[PDB]
Coordinates of C-alpha atoms and ligand atoms in Angstrom, one line a residue:
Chain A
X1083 CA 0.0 0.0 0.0
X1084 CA 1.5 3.2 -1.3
X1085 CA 0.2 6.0 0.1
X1086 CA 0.6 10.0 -1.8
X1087 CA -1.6 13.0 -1.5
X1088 CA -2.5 15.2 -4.5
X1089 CA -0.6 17.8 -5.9
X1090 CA 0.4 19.0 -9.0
X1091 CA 2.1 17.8 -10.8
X1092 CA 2.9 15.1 -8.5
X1093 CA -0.9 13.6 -8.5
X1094 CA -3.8 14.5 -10.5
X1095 CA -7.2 12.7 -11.4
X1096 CA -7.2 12.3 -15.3
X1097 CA -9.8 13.8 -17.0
X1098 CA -11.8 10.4 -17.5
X1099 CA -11.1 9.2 -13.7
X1100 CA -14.9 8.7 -13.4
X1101 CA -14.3 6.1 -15.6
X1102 CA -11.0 4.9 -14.2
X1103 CA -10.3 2.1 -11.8
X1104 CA -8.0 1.7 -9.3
X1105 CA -4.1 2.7 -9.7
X1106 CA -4.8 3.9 -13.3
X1107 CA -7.0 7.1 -12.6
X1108 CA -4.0 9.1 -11.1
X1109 CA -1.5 10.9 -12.9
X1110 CA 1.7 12.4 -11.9
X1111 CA 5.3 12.7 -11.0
X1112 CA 4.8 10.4 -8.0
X1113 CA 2.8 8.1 -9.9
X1114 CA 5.5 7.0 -12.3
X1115 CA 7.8 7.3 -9.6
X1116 CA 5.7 4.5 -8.0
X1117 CA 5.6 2.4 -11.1
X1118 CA 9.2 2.3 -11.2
X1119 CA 10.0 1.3 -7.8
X1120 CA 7.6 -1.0 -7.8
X1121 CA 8.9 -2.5 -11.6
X1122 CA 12.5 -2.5 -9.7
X1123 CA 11.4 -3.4 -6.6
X1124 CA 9.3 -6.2 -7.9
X1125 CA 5.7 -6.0 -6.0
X1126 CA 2.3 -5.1 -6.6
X1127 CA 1.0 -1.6 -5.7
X1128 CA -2.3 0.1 -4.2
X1129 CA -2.0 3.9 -4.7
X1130 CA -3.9 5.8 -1.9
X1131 CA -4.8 9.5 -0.9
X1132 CA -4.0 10.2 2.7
X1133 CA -6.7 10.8 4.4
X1134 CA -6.0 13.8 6.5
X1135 CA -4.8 15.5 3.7
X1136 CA -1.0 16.2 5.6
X1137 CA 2.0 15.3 4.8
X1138 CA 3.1 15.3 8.6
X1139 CA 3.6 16.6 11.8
X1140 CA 3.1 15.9 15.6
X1141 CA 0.3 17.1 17.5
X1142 CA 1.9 19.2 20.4
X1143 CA -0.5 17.7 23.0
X1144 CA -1.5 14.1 22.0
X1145 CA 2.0 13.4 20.5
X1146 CA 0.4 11.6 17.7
X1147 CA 1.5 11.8 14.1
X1148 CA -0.3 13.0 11.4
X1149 CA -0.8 12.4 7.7
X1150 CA 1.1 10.3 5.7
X1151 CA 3.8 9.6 8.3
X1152 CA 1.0 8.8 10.5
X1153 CA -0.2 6.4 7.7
X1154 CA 3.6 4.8 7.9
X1155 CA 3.8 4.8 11.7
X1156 CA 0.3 3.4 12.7
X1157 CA 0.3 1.0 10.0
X1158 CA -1.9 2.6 7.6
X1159 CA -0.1 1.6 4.8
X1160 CA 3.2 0.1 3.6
X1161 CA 5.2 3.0 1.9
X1162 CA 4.9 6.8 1.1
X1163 CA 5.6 8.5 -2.4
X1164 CA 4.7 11.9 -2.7
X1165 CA 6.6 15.3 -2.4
X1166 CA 7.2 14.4 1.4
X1167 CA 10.3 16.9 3.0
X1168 CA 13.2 15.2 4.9
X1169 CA 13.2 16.5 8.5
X1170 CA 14.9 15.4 11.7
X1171 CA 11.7 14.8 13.1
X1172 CA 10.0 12.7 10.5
X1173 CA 13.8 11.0 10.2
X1174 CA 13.4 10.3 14.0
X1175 CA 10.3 8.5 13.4
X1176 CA 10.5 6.7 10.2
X1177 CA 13.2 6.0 7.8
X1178 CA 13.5 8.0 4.9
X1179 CA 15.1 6.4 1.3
X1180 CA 18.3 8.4 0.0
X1181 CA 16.3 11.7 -1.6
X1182 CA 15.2 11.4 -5.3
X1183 CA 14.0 15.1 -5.7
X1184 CA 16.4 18.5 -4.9
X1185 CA 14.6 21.4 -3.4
X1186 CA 15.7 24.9 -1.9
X1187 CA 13.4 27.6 -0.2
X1188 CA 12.8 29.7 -2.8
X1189 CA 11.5 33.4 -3.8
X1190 CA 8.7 33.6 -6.3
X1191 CA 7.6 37.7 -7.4
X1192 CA 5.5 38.7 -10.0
X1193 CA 6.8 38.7 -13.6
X1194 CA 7.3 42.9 -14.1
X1195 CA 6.7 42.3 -17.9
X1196 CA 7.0 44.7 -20.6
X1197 CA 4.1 47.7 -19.0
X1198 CA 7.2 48.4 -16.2
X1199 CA 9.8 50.4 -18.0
X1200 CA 12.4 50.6 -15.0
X1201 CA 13.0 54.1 -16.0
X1202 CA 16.0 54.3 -13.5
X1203 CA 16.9 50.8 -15.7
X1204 CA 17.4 52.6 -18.6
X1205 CA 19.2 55.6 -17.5
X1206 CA 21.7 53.2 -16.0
X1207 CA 23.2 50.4 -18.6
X1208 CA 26.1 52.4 -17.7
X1209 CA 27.1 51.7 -14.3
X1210 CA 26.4 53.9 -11.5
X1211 CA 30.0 54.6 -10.8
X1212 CA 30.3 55.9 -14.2
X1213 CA 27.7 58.1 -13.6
X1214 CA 29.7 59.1 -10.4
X1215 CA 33.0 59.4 -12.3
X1216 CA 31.3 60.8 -15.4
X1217 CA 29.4 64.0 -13.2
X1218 CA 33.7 64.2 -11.3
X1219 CA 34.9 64.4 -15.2
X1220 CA 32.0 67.5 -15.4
X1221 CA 33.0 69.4 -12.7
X1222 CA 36.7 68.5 -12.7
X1223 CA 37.1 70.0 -17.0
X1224 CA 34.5 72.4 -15.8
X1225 CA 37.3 74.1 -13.1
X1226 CA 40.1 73.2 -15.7
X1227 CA 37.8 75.8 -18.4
X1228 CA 37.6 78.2 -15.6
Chain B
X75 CA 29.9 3.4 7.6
X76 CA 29.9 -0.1 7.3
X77 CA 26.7 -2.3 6.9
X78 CA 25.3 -3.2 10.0
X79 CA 27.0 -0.6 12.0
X80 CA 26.0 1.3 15.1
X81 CA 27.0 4.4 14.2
X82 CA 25.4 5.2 10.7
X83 CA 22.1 6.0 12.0
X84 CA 23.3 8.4 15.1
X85 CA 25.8 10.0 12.7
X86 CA 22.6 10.2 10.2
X87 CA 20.4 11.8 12.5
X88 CA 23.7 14.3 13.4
X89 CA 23.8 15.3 9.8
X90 CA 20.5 16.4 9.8
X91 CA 20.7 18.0 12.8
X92 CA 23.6 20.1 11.6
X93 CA 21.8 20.6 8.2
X94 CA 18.5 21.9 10.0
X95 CA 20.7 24.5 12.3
X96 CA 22.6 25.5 9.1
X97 CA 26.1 24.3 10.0
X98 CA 26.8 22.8 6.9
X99 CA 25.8 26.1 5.0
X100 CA 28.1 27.8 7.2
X101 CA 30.8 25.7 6.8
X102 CA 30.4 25.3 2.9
X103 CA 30.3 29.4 2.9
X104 CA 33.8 29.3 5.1
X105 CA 35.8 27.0 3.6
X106 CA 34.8 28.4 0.0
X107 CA 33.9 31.9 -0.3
X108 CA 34.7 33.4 2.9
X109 CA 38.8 32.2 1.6
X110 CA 38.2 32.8 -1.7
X111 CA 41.1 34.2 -2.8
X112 CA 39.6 35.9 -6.0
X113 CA 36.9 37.3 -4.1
X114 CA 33.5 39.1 -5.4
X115 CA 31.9 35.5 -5.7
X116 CA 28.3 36.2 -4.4
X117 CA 28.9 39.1 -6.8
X118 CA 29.1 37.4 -10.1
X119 CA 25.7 36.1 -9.0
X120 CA 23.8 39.2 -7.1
X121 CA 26.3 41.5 -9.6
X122 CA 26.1 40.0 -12.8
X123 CA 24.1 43.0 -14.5
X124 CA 25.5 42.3 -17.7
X125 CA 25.6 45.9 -19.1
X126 CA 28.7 48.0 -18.6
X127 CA 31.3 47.7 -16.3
X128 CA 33.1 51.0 -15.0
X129 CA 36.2 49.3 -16.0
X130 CA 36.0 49.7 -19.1
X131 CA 35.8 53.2 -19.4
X132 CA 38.1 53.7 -16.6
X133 CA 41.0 53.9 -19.5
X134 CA 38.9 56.7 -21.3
X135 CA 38.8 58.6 -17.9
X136 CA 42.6 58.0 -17.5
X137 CA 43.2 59.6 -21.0
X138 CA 41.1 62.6 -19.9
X139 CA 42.6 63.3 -16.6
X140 CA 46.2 63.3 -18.6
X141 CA 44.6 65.6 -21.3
X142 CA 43.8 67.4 -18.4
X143 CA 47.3 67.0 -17.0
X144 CA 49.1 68.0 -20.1
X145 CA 46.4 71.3 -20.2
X146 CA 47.4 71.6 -16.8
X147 CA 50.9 71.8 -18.0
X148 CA 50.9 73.6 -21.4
X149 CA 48.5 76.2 -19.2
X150 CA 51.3 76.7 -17.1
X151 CA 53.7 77.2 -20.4
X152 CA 51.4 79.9 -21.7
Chain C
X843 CA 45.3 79.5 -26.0
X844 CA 46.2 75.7 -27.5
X845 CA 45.7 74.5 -23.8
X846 CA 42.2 75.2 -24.2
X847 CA 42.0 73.3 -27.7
X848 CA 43.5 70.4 -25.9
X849 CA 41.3 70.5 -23.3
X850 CA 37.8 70.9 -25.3
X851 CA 39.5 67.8 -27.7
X852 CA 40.2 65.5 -24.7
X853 CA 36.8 66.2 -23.3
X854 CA 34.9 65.8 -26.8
X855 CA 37.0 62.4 -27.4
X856 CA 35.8 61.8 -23.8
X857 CA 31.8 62.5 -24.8
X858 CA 31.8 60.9 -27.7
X859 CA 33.1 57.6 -26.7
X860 CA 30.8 57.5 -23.4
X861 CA 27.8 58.1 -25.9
X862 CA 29.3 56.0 -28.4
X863 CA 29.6 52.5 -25.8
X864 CA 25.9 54.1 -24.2
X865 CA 24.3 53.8 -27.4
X866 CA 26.3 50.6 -28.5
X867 CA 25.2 48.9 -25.5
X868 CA 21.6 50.0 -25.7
X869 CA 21.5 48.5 -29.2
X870 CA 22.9 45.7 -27.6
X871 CA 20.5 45.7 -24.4
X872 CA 17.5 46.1 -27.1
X873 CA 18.7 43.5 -28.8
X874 CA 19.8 40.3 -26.8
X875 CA 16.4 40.8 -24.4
X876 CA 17.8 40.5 -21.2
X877 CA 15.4 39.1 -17.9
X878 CA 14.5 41.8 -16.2
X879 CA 14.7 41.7 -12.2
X880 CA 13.2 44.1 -9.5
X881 CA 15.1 42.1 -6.5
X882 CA 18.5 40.1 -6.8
X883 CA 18.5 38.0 -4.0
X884 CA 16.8 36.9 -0.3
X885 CA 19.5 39.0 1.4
X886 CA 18.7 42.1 -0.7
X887 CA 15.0 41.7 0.2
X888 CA 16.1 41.5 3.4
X889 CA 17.7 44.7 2.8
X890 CA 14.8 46.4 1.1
X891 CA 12.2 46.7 3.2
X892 CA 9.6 47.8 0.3
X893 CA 8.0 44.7 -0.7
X894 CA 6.3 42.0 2.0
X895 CA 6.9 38.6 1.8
X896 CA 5.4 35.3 3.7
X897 CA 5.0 31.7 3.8
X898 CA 2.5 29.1 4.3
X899 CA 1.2 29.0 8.0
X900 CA 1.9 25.3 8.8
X901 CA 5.0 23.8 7.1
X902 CA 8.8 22.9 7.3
X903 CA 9.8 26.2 5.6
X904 CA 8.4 28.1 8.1
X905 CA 10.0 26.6 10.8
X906 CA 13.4 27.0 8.8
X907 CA 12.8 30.0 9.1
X908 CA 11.5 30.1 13.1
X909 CA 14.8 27.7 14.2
X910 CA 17.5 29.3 11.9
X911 CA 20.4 30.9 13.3
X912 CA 21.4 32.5 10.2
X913 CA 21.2 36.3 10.2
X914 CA 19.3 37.7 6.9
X915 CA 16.6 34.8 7.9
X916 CA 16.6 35.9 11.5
X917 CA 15.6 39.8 10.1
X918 CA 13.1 38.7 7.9
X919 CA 11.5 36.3 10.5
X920 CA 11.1 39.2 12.6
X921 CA 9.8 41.0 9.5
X922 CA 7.7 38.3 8.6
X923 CA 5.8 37.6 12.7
X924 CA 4.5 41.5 12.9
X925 CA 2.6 42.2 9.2
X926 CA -0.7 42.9 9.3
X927 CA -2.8 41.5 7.3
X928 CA -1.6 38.2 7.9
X929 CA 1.5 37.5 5.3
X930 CA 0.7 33.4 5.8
X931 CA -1.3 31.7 3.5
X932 CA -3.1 27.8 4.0
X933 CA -2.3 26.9 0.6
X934 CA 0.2 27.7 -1.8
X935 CA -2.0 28.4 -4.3
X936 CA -3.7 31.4 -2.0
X937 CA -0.4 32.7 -1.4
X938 CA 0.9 32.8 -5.4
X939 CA -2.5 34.2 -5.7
X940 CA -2.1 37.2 -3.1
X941 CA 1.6 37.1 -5.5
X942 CA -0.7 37.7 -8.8
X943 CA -3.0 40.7 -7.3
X944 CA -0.7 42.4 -5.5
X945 CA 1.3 44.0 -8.7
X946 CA 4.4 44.1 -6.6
X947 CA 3.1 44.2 -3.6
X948 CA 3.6 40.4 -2.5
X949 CA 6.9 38.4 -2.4
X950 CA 6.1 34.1 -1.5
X951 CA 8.5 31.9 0.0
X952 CA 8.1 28.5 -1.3
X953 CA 10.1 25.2 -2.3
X954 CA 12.0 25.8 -5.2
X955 CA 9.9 22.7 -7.1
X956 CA 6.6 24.0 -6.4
X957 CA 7.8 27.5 -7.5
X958 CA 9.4 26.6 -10.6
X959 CA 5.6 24.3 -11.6
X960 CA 4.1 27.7 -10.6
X961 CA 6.4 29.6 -13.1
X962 CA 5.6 27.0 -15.8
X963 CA 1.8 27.3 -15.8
X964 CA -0.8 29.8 -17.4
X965 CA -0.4 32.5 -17.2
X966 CA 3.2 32.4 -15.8
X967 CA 2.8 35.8 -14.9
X968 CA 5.2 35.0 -12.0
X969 CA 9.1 34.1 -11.8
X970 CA 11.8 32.2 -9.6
X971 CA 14.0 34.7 -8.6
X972 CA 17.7 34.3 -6.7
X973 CA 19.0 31.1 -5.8
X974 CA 17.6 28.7 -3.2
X975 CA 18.1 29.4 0.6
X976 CA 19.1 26.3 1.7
X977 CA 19.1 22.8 0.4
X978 CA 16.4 19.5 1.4
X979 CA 15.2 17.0 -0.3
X980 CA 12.2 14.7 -0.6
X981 CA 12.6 11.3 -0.7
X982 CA 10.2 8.3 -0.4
X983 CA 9.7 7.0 3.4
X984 CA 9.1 3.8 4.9
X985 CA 8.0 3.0 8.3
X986 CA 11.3 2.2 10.6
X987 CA 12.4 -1.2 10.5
X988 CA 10.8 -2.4 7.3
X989 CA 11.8 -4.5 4.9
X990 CA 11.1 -2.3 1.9
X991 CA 13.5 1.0 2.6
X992 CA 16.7 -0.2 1.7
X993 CA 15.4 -2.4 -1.7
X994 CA 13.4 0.6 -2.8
X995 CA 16.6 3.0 -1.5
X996 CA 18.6 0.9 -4.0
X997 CA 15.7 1.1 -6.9
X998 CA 16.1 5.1 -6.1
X999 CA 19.8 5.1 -6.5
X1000 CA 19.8 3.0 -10.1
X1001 CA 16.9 5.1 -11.1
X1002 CA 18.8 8.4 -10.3
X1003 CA 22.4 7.1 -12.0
X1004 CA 20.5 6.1 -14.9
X1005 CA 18.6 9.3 -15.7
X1006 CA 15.0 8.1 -15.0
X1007 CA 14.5 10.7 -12.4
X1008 CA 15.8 13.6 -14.3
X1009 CA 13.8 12.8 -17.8
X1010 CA 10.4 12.3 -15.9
X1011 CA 11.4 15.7 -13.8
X1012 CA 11.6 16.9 -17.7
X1013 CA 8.4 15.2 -18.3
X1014 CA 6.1 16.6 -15.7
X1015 CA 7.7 20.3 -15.2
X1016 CA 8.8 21.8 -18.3
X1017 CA 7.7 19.5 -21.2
X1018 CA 4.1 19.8 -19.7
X1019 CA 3.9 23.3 -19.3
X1020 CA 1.4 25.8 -20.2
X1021 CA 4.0 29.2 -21.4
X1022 CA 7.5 28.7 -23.8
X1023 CA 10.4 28.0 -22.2
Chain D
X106 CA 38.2 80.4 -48.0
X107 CA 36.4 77.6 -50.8
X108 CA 39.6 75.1 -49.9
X109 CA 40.0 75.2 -46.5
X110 CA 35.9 74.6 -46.4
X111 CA 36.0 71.5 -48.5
X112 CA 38.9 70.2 -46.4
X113 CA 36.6 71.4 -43.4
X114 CA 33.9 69.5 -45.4
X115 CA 35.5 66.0 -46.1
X116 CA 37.3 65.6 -42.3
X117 CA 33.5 66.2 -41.3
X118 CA 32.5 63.3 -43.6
X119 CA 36.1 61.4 -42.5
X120 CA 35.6 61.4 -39.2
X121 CA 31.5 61.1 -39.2
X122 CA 31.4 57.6 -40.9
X123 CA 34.7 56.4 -38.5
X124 CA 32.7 57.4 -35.4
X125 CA 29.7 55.7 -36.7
X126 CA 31.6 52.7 -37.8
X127 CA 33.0 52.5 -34.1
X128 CA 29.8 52.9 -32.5
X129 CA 28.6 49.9 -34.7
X130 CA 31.5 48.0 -34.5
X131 CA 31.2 48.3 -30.2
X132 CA 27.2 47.2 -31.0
X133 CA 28.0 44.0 -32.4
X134 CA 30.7 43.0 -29.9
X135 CA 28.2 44.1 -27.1
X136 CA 25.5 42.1 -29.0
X137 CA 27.2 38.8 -29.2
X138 CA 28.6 38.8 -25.2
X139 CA 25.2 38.5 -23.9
X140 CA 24.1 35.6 -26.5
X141 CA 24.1 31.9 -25.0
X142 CA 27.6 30.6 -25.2
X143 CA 27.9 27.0 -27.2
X144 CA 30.4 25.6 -25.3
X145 CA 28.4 25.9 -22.0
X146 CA 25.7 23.4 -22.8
X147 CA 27.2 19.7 -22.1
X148 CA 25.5 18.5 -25.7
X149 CA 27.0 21.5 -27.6
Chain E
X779 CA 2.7 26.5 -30.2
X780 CA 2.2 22.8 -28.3
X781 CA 3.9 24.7 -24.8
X782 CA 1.3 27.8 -25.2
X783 CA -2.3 28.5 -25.0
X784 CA -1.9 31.9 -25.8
X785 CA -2.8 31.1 -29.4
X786 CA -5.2 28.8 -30.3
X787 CA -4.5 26.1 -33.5
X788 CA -6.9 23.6 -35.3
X789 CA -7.2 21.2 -38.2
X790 CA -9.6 20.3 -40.8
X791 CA -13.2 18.2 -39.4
X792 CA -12.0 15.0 -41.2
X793 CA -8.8 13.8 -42.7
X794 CA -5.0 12.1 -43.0
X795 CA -4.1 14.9 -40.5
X796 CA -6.9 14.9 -37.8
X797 CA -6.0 11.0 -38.1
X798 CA -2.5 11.7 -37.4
X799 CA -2.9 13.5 -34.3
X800 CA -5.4 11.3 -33.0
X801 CA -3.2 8.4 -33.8
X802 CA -0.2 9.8 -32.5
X803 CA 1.8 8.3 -29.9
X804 CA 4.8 10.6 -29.4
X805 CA 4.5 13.4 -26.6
X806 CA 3.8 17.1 -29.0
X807 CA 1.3 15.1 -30.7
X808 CA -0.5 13.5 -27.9
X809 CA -0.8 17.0 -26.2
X810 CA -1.7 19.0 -29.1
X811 CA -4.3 16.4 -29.5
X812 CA -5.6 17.0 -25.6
X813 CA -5.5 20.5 -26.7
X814 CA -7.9 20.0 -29.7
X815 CA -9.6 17.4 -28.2
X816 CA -11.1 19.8 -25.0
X817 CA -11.1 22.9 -26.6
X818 CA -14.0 24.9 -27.2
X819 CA -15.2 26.8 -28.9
X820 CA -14.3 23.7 -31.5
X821 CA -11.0 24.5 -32.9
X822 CA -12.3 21.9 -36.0
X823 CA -13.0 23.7 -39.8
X824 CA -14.7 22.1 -42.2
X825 CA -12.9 23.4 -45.4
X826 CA -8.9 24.5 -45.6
Chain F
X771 CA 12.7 -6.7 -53.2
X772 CA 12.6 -9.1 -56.1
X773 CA 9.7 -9.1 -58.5
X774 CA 7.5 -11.6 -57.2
X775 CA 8.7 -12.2 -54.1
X776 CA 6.4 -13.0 -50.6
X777 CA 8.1 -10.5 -48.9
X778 CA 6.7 -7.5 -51.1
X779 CA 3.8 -6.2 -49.3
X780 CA 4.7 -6.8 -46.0
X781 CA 7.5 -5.0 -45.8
X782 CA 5.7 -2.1 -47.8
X783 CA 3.2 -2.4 -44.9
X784 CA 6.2 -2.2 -42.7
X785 CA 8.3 1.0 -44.3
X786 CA 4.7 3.2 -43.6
X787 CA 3.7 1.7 -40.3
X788 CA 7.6 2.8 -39.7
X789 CA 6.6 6.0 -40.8
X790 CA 3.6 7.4 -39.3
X791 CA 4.9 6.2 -35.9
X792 CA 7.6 8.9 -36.5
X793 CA 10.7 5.6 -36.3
X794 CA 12.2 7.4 -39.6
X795 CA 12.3 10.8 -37.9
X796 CA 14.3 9.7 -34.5
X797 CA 16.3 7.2 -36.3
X798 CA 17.8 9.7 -38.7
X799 CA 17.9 12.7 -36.1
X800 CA 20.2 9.4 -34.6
X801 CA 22.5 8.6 -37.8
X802 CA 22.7 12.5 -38.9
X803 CA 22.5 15.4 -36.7
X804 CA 22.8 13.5 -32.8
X805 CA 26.5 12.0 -34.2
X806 CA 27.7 15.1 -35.6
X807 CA 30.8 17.0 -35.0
X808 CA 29.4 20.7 -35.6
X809 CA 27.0 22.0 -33.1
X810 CA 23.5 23.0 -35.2
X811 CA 23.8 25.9 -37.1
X812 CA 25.5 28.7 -35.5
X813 CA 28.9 27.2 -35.1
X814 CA 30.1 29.4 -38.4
X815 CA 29.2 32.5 -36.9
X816 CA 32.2 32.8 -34.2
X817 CA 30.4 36.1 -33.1
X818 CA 32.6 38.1 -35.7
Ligands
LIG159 C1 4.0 21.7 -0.6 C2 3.8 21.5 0.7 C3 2.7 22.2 1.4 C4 4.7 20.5 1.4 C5 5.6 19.7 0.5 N1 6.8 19.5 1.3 C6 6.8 20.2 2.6 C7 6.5 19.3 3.8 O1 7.0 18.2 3.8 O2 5.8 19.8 4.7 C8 5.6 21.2 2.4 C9 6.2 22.5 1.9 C10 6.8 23.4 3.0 O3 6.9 22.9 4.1 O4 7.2 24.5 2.7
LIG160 C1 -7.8 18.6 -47.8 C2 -8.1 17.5 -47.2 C3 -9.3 17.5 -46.3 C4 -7.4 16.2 -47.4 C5 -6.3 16.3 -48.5 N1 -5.3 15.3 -48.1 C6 -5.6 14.7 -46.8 C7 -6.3 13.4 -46.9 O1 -6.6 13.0 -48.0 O2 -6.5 12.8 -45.8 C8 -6.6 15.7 -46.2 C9 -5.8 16.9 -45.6 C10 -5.9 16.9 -44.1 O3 -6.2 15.8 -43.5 O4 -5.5 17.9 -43.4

């Protein structure tokens, strides 16, 4: 029993997923990546969504796990595929495989397009030091004419 | 470590530790950049306007200052 | 007074070559069509205090940013705990949302693989900017003691060497995407 | 003076079309930097 | 045009090219084919 | 193949099967441009 939770693209219903059975109505990164460990590894596979919807974490009063490392603790189900973080305290917990997947907290901004000019952008393809030097060069002849 | 060992999981757990605390970042950054003999690596990245360098014209400013040198001196012939 | 000619022919040399390389590198900016920017990196958005920017409310990047001893992170924590309105979102998708109608106004902190699925989809209105913060990865767990984790460890490690990994990551991100390239 | 004008008149030209040609000349060099080298994809 | 839906693209109602797409196995095709297949309003002309 | 021969029409079958499923396409993107020595096109160039 593999368990995953949606996300794009790691899980998706396909279009026709009303008419789908079983392992073949989701699609996504995770999905293949369960067909091949499973076509290496050599077993047969039940993909599942997790049913709280977490990946996981530990309820600060009950000390119980939640989510999918929950699912692999409590015996929910046999493995876990999806975009799931290594952390010391999931690592604590259960064992995590050697990472298949690179990630890096990251900044995402809004695209400024062509409607922003940056006009400060284009009165500096010249440097600003040679705006500094160029404005020393001004006043500097300037005293040398006087 | 070797297979079956005692200490692979301990020293496992340690590297995450270290990695969540951002030791190892630290330590990369030291033994790297922070030496860097050549220096101005961040820059290349944070820096890297393409555009124009001062540099470049730095020559053309060194020309004028001369010109202004050699004005300087022909003004004083005159 | 030849002093003077020398002078006004040093400093016209000096003009014209400064207009000369600004309008050859104009032609040359107008040309190539380079990416355009408004921040460089984390530490400079640390440093500019102009634009807000959050994270998801529960999630492992937010506490990399809570237990961090790193300095820029530290600043922009304490940034990050007094904004009003709230600057955490419950899903991604809310926050790159606040990201699309705030024209500017709204910076997200996110894993670089969400982020750059994000970039790649309609309308892609929004980009990956600097390089990432720190460095995780995912990786597929099994519960502690079970007989699968080291044969499907192994099954990760030929499937890595061997490019599966990378050409799916090329399948699902990129090759599926909604806007160019 | 008709001589010294046309002298006046062909440095103008002289020196017009070499300035030009070195703003041109610094466009294309300036152009091609910022192109995607060959050598730095692997395949290439 | 397969990695944008900026602008939309079509093919005749009936023919060796609708019958290609549809038939097509390799990755372009099969999308573009998605992409014709969904769309609306129907991307499909009856005459070139 | 020979005039006559049984293996005629099955192997004209087999050229256009090969075709539509694009085999001719990667197999000489393989043989001719994959194996070559001279990146694409703008090798020439040099950036003047
Ligand atoms: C995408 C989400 C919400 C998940 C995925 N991995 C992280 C996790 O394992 O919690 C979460 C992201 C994050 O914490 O920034
Ligand atoms: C013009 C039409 C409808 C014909 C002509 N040849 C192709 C055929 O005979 O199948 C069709 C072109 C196409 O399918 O786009």
């Amino acid at each position: 029993v593999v368990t995953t939770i949606l996300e794009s693209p790691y899980v998706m219903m396909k279009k026709n997923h009303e008419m789908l059975e079983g392992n073949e109505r989701y699609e996504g990164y995770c999905v293949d990546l369960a067909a091949e460990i499973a076509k290496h590894c050599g077993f047969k596979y039940k993909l599942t969504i997790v049913g709280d919807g977490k990946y996981g974490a530990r309820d600060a009063d009950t000390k119980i796990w939640n989510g999918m490392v929950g699912e692999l603790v409590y015996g929910k189900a046999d493995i876990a595929i999806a975009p799931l973080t290594i952390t010391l305290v999931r690592e604590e917990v259960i064992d995590f495989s050697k990472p298949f997947m690179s990630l890096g907290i990251s900044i995402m901004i809004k695209k400024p397009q062509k409607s922003k000019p940056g006009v400060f952008s284009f009165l500096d393809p010249l440097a600003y030091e040679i705006w500094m030097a160029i404005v020393f060069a001004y006043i500097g002849v300037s005293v040398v004419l006087f | 470590t070797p297979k079956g060992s005692s200490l692979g999981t301990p020293v496992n757990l340690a590297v995450l530790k270290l990695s969540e605390q951002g030791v190892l970042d630290k330590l990369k950054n030291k033994w790297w950049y922070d030496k860097g003999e050549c220096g101005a690596k961040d820059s290349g990245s944070k820096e890297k306007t393409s555009a124009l360098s001062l540099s470049n014209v730095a020559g053309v400013f060194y020309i004028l200052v001369g010109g202004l040198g050699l004005a300087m001196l022909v003004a004083l012939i005159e | 007074s030849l002093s003077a000619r020398i002078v006004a022919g040093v400093w016209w040399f000096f003009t014209l070559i400064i207009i000369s390389s600004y309008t050859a590198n104009l032609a040359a900016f107008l040309t190539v069509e380079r990416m355009v920017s408004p921040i460089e990196s984390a530490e400079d958005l640390s440093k500019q205090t102009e634009i807000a920017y959050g994270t998801l409310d529960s999630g492992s990047t937010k506490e990399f940013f809570r237990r961090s001893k790193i300095a820029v992170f530290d600043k922009m924590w304490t940034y990050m705990r007094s904004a009003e309105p709230s600057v955490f979102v419950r899903t991604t998708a809310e926050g790159v949302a606040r990201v699309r109608k705030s024209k500017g106004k709204y910076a997200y902190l996110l894993e670089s693989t969400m982020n750059e699925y994000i970039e790649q989809r309609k309308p892609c209105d929004t980009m990956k900017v600097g390089g990432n913060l720190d460095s995780k990865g995912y990786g597929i767990a099994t519960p502690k003691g079970s007989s699968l984790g080291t044969p499907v460890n192994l099954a990760v490690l030929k499937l890595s060497e061997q490019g599966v990994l990378d050409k799916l990551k090329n399948k699902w991100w990129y090759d599926k995407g909604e806007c160019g390239a």
